[PDB]
């Protein structure tokens, strides 16, 4: 029935916290160090002066 919640979509319980949660973004993250082969343990070598 309409009142029943057993078959409710549980993805709708997580309310949208951002506007465009469904639009697909194909570009790469401008802040991701993905093409920079730097060890995660020396990430402070990138720290600002």
């Amino acid at each position: 029935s309409g009142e029943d919640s057993s078959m409710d979509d549980i993805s709708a319980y997580s309310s949208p916290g951002l506007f465009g949660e469904d639009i697909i973004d194909r570009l790469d993250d401008p802040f991701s160090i993905e093409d920079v082969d730097i060890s995660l343990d020396v990430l402070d070598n990138l720290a600002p002066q």
Binding site: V36, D37, I38, V42, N45, L46
Partner: protein, 76 residues
């Protein structure tokens, strides 16, 4: 690495060898004057990897790689 046995030998088991044979391979400690590759990531320049002469710091309380401040320009 003894050539006659074609295998690696521990130094504590070679107390009876007196000397070393020709063709033997000895893995010795790093000493002052040895060359080392110094590298800082991200390696973006041709000088990001350079070879320095090793100066061994015998102070047991020093754990850092010490370098001249004028050498920092090679590695940014």
């Amino acid at each position: 690495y003894k050539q006659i046995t074609q295998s690696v030998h521990d130094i504590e088991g070679l107390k009876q060898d007196f000397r070393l044979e020709v063709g033997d391979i000895l893995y010795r400690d790093v000493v002052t004057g040895d060359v080392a590759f110094f590298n800082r990531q991200p390696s973006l320049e041709r000088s990001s990897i350079g070879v320095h002469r090793i100066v061994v710091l015998e102070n047991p309380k020093i754990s850092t790689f010490q370098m001249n401040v004028s050498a920092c320009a090679w590695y940014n």
